[PDB]
Design an enzyme around this catalytic site. Structure first.
Site, PDB file in Angstrom:
ATOM      1  N   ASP A  16       0.847  -1.185   0.000  1.00  0.00           N
ATOM      2  CA  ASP A  16       0.000   0.000   0.000  1.00  0.00           C
ATOM      3  C   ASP A  16       0.888   1.243   0.000  1.00  0.00           C
ATOM      4  O   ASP A  16       1.892   1.296   0.707  1.00  0.00           O
ATOM      5  CB  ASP A  16      -0.936   0.004   1.210  1.00  0.00           C
ATOM      6  CG  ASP A  16      -1.773   1.265   1.302  1.00  0.00           C
ATOM      7  OD1 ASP A  16      -1.338   2.217   1.982  1.00  0.00           O
ATOM      8  OD2 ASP A  16      -2.865   1.303   0.695  1.00  0.00           O
ATOM      9  N   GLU A  18       0.965   5.710   0.082  1.00  0.00           N
ATOM     10  CA  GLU A  18       0.253   6.962   0.271  1.00  0.00           C
ATOM     11  C   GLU A  18       0.926   7.980  -0.626  1.00  0.00           C
ATOM     12  O   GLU A  18       2.148   7.977  -0.767  1.00  0.00           O
ATOM     13  CB  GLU A  18       0.276   7.414   1.731  1.00  0.00           C
ATOM     14  CG  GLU A  18      -0.249   6.379   2.719  1.00  0.00           C
ATOM     15  CD  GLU A  18      -1.690   5.965   2.461  1.00  0.00           C
ATOM     16  OE1 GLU A  18      -2.041   4.815   2.800  1.00  0.00           O
ATOM     17  OE2 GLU A  18      -2.478   6.779   1.936  1.00  0.00           O
ATOM     18  N   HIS A 174      -6.918   4.358   6.330  1.00  0.00           N
ATOM     19  CA  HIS A 174      -6.247   5.424   5.588  1.00  0.00           C
ATOM     20  C   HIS A 174      -4.828   5.708   6.091  1.00  0.00           C
ATOM     21  O   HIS A 174      -4.206   6.688   5.689  1.00  0.00           O
ATOM     22  CB  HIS A 174      -7.099   6.698   5.565  1.00  0.00           C
ATOM     23  CG  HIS A 174      -8.558   6.437   5.351  1.00  0.00           C
ATOM     24  ND1 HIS A 174      -9.023   5.529   4.425  1.00  0.00           N
ATOM     25  CD2 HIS A 174      -9.656   6.949   5.959  1.00  0.00           C
ATOM     26  CE1 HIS A 174     -10.344   5.500   4.461  1.00  0.00           C
ATOM     27  NE2 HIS A 174     -10.753   6.353   5.384  1.00  0.00           N
ATOM     28  N   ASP A 179      -3.520  -0.334   6.608  1.00  0.00           N
ATOM     29  CA  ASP A 179      -4.173  -0.748   5.371  1.00  0.00           C
ATOM     30  C   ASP A 179      -3.494  -1.965   4.753  1.00  0.00           C
ATOM     31  O   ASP A 179      -4.165  -2.903   4.327  1.00  0.00           O
ATOM     32  CB  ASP A 179      -4.217   0.400   4.363  1.00  0.00           C
ATOM     33  CG  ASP A 179      -5.279   1.424   4.695  1.00  0.00           C
ATOM     34  OD1 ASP A 179      -6.172   1.119   5.510  1.00  0.00           O
ATOM     35  OD2 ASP A 179      -5.228   2.533   4.131  1.00  0.00           O
TER      36      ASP A 179
HETATM   37 MG   LIG Z   1      -4.084   3.657   2.454  1.00  0.00          MG
HETATM   38 MG   LIG Z   2      -4.550   2.095  -0.620  1.00  0.00          MG
END
Ligand SMILES: [Mg+2]
Ligand SMILES: [Mg+2]
Length: 208
Positions: A16, A18, A174, A179
Site C-alpha cells: 500500500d 500513500e 487510511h 491498510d
Molecule cells: Mg491507504
Molecule cells: Mg490504498
DNA sequence: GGCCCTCTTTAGGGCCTC
C-alpha cells in the site's frame, strides 16, 4: 503445498502506498508498506515480513492539497523519519528478492487493493530512482478488490474485511501500515477460504 | 479534486484506490 506452487511461481507481496495525488507520473510518493507472505506445511497462507517507510517527495513532485487532506500527511514535518524513494524501494526489493530465492519462486507479484493504483506509483518511483532488476511483475497484479468481489461480494476494503469476519478499525484506516496489514490478512483469508472449501488444490475440486 | 446519479440543473452527496 509450497508457496511456489500456488501462483505459478509468483511471490505475492502486499503493498500500500500513500501519495500526494492520483497521477503516478507527477505526484509525490509519500509512504509505502510491504508485507511478504509465507505458506506453512499444511498449505495455509499467512503474513511473513513487514516493511514500512515514510517517503520524501521527489524533487519536482506535485502535491495536491486534497490528497494531503485525505491521508493527513505533512511532507514538511521534519520528524517524519522520511527517506528517499531510492532508499525505501531498494530495501523492499532486496527483501523481496531474498524471499523469492528462499521460496523457490521466479518473481514477485504485487497484491494491493485496487492494485493498479499502487502498482502505477511503485513503477514510477522505481523509474525515477533508477532501480534495476525490479522483482515485481511489470503489469500483472493481484487486486484484492476484485478478489473480494468474488469471495465476499464486496469491493470496498473496509466492507470486504467486515464481511470476511475480520476486525476493521475506522480510526486506523487510511494509514499505510494498517491498510497493508488488513489487505494482507484479507488476501490470506480469501486464499485460505478457497482451500477450506475444497477449491484448492485442483485435485480436491475434482472430488465427488 | 471531479464525474456521476437523481428526491437534478438555482444541488447534494456517493464514489472509497490518494
Ligand atoms: Mg491507504
Ligand atoms: Mg490504498
Amino acid at each position: 503445498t509450497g508457496l511456489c506452487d500456488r501462483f505459478r511461481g509468483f511471490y505475492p507481496v502486499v503493498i500500500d502506498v500513500e501519495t500526494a495525488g492520483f497521477n503516478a507520473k507527477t505526484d509525490a510518493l509519500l509512504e509505502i508498506a510491504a508485507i511478504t507472505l509465507k505458506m506453512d506445511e499444511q498449505g495455509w497462507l499467512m503474513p511473513d515480513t513487514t516493511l514500512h517507510f515514510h517517503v520524501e517527495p521527489f524533487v519536482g513532485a506535485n502535491l495536491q492539497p486534497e490528497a494531503l487532506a485525505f491521508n493527513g500527511i505533512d511532507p514538511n514535518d521534519p520528524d517524519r523519519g522520511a527517506v528517499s524513494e531510492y532508499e525505501a524501494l531498494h530495501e523492499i526489493f532486496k527483501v523481496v528478492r531474498k524471499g523469492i530465492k528462499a521460496s523457490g519462486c521466479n518473481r514477485a507479484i504485487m497484491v494491493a487493493h485496487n492494485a493498479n493504483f499502487d502498482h502505477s506509483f511503485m513503477m514510477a518511483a522505481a523509474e525515477r530512482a533508477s532501480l534495476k532488476r525490479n522483482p515485481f511483475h511489470p503489469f500483472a497484479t493481484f487486486d484484492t478488490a476484485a478478489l473480494a468481489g468474488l469471495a465476499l461480494g464486496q469491493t470496498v476494503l473496509s466492507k470486504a474485511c467486515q464481511t470476511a469476519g475480520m476486525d476493521f478499525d475506522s480510526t486506523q484506516a487510511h494509514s499505510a501500515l494498517y491498510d497493508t496489514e488488513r489487505t494482507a490478512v484479507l488476501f490470506c483469508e480469501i486464499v485460505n477460504r478457497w482451500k477450506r472449501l475444497g477449491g484448492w488444490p485442483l485435485s480436491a475440486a475434482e472430488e465427488v
